[PDB]
Symmetry: D2
Subunit: 336 residues, 4 copies
């Protein structure tokens, strides 16, 4: 097998040859055919997060492919199913979160490519109770970003308490941003995109955004959004969480609205507690959703209502991709 | 004829006990004879004009004024004379926007506020909208029902927006008037109440009022670890009643993953926020002000059954400035009876 | 002055098109020059007086009267002299009961109804309450917006109380005056639609409007079996628009375990209900007839955005009786 | 060997047989049974008069509590000697939409205790470690067996009434489920009205926390009395013992927009006034025992001393007698220790 192993933090990933994993009880083995590249993989490679991985680990939580083995205890998943290995790898199974349909909040959970070896390889051992099952009518390259970006933005839009026909701003139309635009349009929600570029605003207009505001050349983007979204978006999905981005997001959401945050920035953002209380503003965090959310997002991608603009790549240029993310659609490694 | 009120002639200057004229009830408006008006930090902040949107002087503060209906407007339909009503913080609302039609009239924009945008309950008489006054339980005295109009409804709605259910842990941070009121409300909702405050007599007050877990912020290595230990993993809901600067960080540490932190205070300036922590833990941070008419009526029902009572420190109108002095360093309530 | 009005002089007798005094609004009231007026089976029942609570003749039926605001009473504050408004089923509410305070004025014990408890839209003028009249989008004419005051709001609220989410399955049964509106709303609200009806012109219309699944009730050995086949196990929401002993039983069969059955009709009599089946399957059965002011506003937003278009056949007042005869597509009494 | 009250064939007295003890194969736990509630579901499993009949010979009973006598291969979390229960739900598929949504009771390929696999009416029952309730330590097995079926059923039925603390829930038909539901709705911040055909049961409810009683027999109509003593109608109606009279009365008792939750499993159909049910906005939902999380929550209420089932101790060899007796105050719990 060939992987991209973070042997020591900070130093660039080296394309080594590591042994082929083999599944244990209730464990399947996936033959990766695509593997999305996310900024969470960059932060796992560098290691600048409170709780860190123990290198050498293989990153990547967007690996999709075939089941090439079942570890002799697996009941449902067959050998040939189109599966993927998302962020959530396992869970305890008995805590209040695992029992309430909220296993992403489990405190003993593992994370693919963070606490266990991930998608940046040919074969991965995964847990069949947590893998996502993929629709047939979608190729692996266009379904890999949905395993972390699609589910993240779908759950983020679900936690804004927004219904169809309500205004949701998608802030920072990147890869996650364009995926979120597609999901928000597929849910009946009016969309108002806000980014710093104008080509991305054109892309959002193509994707069903009826409102666009340039967050870099408008006098105040929040006033523009409140003008066009009938007095403030009912939900704001902040996709790339930065400063003046969280600020404009707080300014754009209408009273009683919800600011879902789908990024993991560093530092401590200021929060106008007075304004949040006076406006009844909810601010909620959400990293990639649960198994039901993943399944529903894969079903949105099986109807051709959400498509991921993907730039194919081999394994050997992963470093460059991280370089491209260090400076600043979606980069899917091509294992097929 | 004439009435006595605590007017704010200019911001930051001592409130003046004036003999202002009695307000008259406009068409669709009732006139209430105040009997016990509560004092809140909001009254001091309105008199001091230290908020982003400021009141317009001269104005009479006070949004916890309970009493009898002394007059009815030319057209009112459901509030009659003698109805023991209390004029809350939410004075009016437009009644046609997406918030007032949805039953979220406290989020409206054309809304007024008693004692802030209009004259309030620090007087012998007031003028209020009958569609927005609360209806008090007849088995509770005015002096004991005045704090419910702001403190009680604020903590009640704050507990309702924590999205907890009976049997869940709720940490009532900052046991002041709001803190003890919220302890009682969380007990009356079948929730297990952990209590955190720097003082200790207030922690014993929490103990008697229903709290089974009490943590002293001053004398623990870190209060959030004690809360997480004694609540089996962190409270499902945290209600920060006294958000000064670090109760917020302690609350964020106390809450469990997927839990909700509800803020009821109006502290100055901006507070840090571990967006990484709040996102990775699934935390929800929500801001809560008093609450709507349904929530006010529900809190009044709770105060009518005797499951929630406030410790009041009765005082007179002429002491208002002195009270405000004490408020620069137990819900204070004035007595017009 | 005088206006034309299809008065129900007494129950049983046919409607009498008469010259009746022009209704002048009073303190806190407005007047709506009725350009168009939809026709519903509720109006026929009011004309026939065959309900447990009956109207009080002579009364003017009609709860879909749209038009301009002609006059305003001394006191009105939000509507102006000439806005496109409509008078829906809900004419007033107490304002202070727990239902009104909670945003549920459709449940007020003291609600007045248009065309049932007070006069209505089957006339050239009406006196309505400005706090409860819907506000019409200006890009849709009265003829095509009259059905949205009863049918559109009814099916919108029914779909909302099915507790469904975008990507779910809702089975619309009875594609008629309500069913095609329901198909359009369920497609605009983001749900997968399955239509069920006895007729095949109705099924063709539904398949056009976005019903990915259509099953014929009378040309299928067992319909519910085929619906469950083509919905992966049944629908999370089942909207019964034409409530029948056949329709309700088939709806119970079609819904999935845990799903909701929304009954939007008002049939007569007492219907069978397998309590064992309901409890075992965890079925939920609700009943909603017309949505609230905010749900009306949301349905009007869907209508004005273009995502929902009623199919309308127009008439004049003078043949309302014939329509009532034909009451044994949505008829709209054009009188602009 | 054990003392299994086997249903060797449907319709016959249960043979008290010395069957072999089941063994904990891979991924399973074996429980030694110290107590076991008796429910009418067990009687209907014995008589097989339900649509999906069981398959004899089988051991009924879905309330068996005790210690984990043995742990099978692969099991990681449940230790031998833990106080576990074996509830109505035995297993689920683990991958369907209902399972992933926290609704594994709604599953299609689920198993049932004492209905589709051998159950609690024995000394040892082999259960699935992922679905066994984990009992508190301050409650006896004889007093915690009824919670596994009656307590969970009433708790979940109260939760699906979508009522909030301070609401009104009418508990119709005080029995085992009825009295446990009175206690649960009390421990939820809810006001509890009680309706029953006896009168000693109304006294028991009046003592267990209920504040409104109406005799379903000696009254001209229970619905009017309930509507008058709940101020317009109850927000929730938990129907514990369900019948054509009880269902009609419940639909009459509930306020508009309220939920009528059904816990019984009666044969046949029932009349539904669709005109009234649609005009009134009523919701008629049917609830069965409950999910693993709700079982945990019910056991937590039972441990904390807020819910106690009035257990009437029996032995194993008179189960048939109880079955005849079931053709009954409190919950007949067999004592197998
Ligand atoms: Zn990622
Ligand atoms: Zn867990
Ligand atoms: Zn206050
Ligand atoms: Zn408003
Ligand atoms: Zn009302
Ligand atoms: Zn209608
Ligand atoms: Zn049972
Ligand atoms: Zn399942």
């Amino acid at each position: 097998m060939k992987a991209a192993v973070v042997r020591e933090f900070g130093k660039p990933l080296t394309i080594d040859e590591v042994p082929v994993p083999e599944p244990g009880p209730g464990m399947i083995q996936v033959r990766i055919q695509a593997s999305g590249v996310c900024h969470t993989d960059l932060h796992a490679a560098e290691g600048d997060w409170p709780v860190k991985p123990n290198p050498p680990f293989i990153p990547g939580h967007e690996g999709v492919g075939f089941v090439s083995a079942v570890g002799a205890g697996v009941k449902h998943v067959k050998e040939g199913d189109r599966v993927g290995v998302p962020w959530l790898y396992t869970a305890c199974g008995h805590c209040r979160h695992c029992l309430g349909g909220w296993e992403t909040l489990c405190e003993s959970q593992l994370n693919t490519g963070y606490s266990v070896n991930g998608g940046f390889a040919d074969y991965v051992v995964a847990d069949p109770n947590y893998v996502g099952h993929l629709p047939k009518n979608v190729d692996f390259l266009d379904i890999a970003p949905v395993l972390c970006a699609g589910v993240t933005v779908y759950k983020g839009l679900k936690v804004t308490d927004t219904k169809p026909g309500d205004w949701v701003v998608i802030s920072g139309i990147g890869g996650l941003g364009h995926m979120a635009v597609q999901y928000a349009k597929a849910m009946g929600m009016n969309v108002a995109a806000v980014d710093i570029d104008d080509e991305k605003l054109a892309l959002a207009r193509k994707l069903g955004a009826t409102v666009t505001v340039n967050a870099a050349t408008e006098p105040d983007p929040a006033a523009a959004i409140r003008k066009q979204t009938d007095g403030g978006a009912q939900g704001v999905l902040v996709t790339a969480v930065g400063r003046k981005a969280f600020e404009q997001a707080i300014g754009m959401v209408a009273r009683g609205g919800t600011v879902a945050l789908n990024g993991l920035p560093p530092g401590d953002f200021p929060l106008d507690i007075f304004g949040m209380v006076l406006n009844g503003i909810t601010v909620r965090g959400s990293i990639v959703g649960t198994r039901l959310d993943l399944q529903e997002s894969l079903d949105f991608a099986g109807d051709g209502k959400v498509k991921a603009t993907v730039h194919k790549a081999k394994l050997e240029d992963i470093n460059n991709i991280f370089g491209q993310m260090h400076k600043g659609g979606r980069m899917v490694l091509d294992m097929a």
